[PDB]
Amino acid sequence: SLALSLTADQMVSALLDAEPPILYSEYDPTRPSEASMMGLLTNLADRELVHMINWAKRVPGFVDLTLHDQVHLLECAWLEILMIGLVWRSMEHPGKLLFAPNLLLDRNQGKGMVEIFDMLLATSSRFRMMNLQGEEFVCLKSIILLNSGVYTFSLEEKDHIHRVLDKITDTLIHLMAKAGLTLQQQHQRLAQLLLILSHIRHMSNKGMEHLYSMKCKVPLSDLLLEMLDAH
């Protein structure tokens, strides 16, 4: 409710003002290894999660959902959202991943970690070639939040979610018609953007099982463990 009454411009503004800050890592240079890097990424992701949760609440429609439903959506999409956030801010850094303003990495240092790094780099290149706009990005990210767990949790309820997704789709199209794209180009770019979400899912799934494996071996946040032991 209410979220289904927003205009496209109001939808965009809402998402833009809801944007979480870009956090710094505890990265202290003059000293390079594995585990240490994973520790920094864990420390970073831990603090980002708190902002993501508060960001998720500002996402139009999300607040209207059950507490249990909110939990499930975040449990499914948290790494996807972290990764598309990483990929987005890494756009103007070709061949590099900007985890934090003070933590810029290429595929060299990140050496199964390498496979995920290349997939993230490939997504960032794809965004750069597509010349992804910030208005489009915040749409994609909020789509991930609502879509990633909609087929895992008479309640529905899931009809409301689909109604909001349709609203974001209209928002995306509104943005593309604004940038002078023809109707054909609007459909194509829309398709291009949503097909990347498949690979963002793929990277998350791959990253998820990587975190699962080392859990039996680096220390993880009590919130991050909460996320992992729920997927």
Binding site: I53, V71, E226
Partner: peptide, 9 residues
């Protein structure tokens, strides 16, 4: 569930 925190705050 720590995730319940923040979500009700």
């Amino acid at each position: 569930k720590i995730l319940h925190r923040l979500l009700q705050d």
